[PDB]
């Protein structure tokens, strides 16, 4: 009941919007694959 459908080519875009900051965060990764903030 799960299926895939194509969504495009993988390319870098020169005109791309730039956004978001660059945070430094202390985290732990548990065996379930969940990150949590320390």
């Amino acid at each position: 009941d799960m299926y895939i459908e194509r969504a495009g080519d993988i390319t870098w875009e020169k005109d791309a919007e730039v956004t978001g900051n660059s945070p430094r965060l202390d985290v732990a990764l548990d065996e379930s694959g969940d990150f949590s903030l320390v």
Partner: protein
């Protein structure tokens, strides 16, 4: 199974729902474990069975071993090729931050997209996929930061 970025859909009762995104490369489909829970996929080529996976990395590959080998250089800006549910694929550029863990640093992107964007590829300037988006943390103001998750 042509190379590119794909939506991962579930058919449900009335109409489809996008639960994630993945990358087809070198005949292998790559997505995040939480998108498929490691279950089989239908495609135009037929059924894709899970081949490799790792819950702690939150990754799974289909038809073959993990093929994406490029890594963030720790310095350069990157692009998220976001494929959000119901929206056209879109590139967004950012300078990654850092997840600092006891075992080392992971690049991380402070970009917030719907849950079904999970598995969207993060690119370097050469167009190589350096990781997949969508395993992250919610910081104090409610915004989201995703690891740049690459198969080890």
């Amino acid at each position: 199974t042509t190379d590119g970025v794909y939506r991962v859909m579930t058919r449900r009762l009335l109409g489809s729902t996008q639960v994630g995104v993945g990358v087809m490369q070198e005949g292998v489909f790559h997505t995040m474990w939480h998108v498929t829970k490691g279950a089989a996929l239908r495609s135009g080529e037929g059924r894709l069975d899970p081949y490799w996976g790792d819950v702690k990395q939150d990754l799974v590959s289909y038809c073959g071993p993990w093929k994406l080998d490029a890594a963030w250089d720790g310095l350069s800006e990157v692009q998220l090729l976001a494929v959000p549910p119901g929206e056209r694929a879109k590139n967004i550029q950012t300078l990654p931050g850092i997840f600092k863990t006891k075992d080392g640093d992971i690049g991380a992107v402070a970009l917030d997209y719907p849950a079904g964007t999970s598995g969207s590829p993060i690119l370097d300037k050469c167009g190589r996929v350096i990781g997949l988006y969508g395993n992250g943390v919610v910081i104090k103001n409610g915004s989201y930061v995703s690891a740049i998750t690459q198969g080890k």
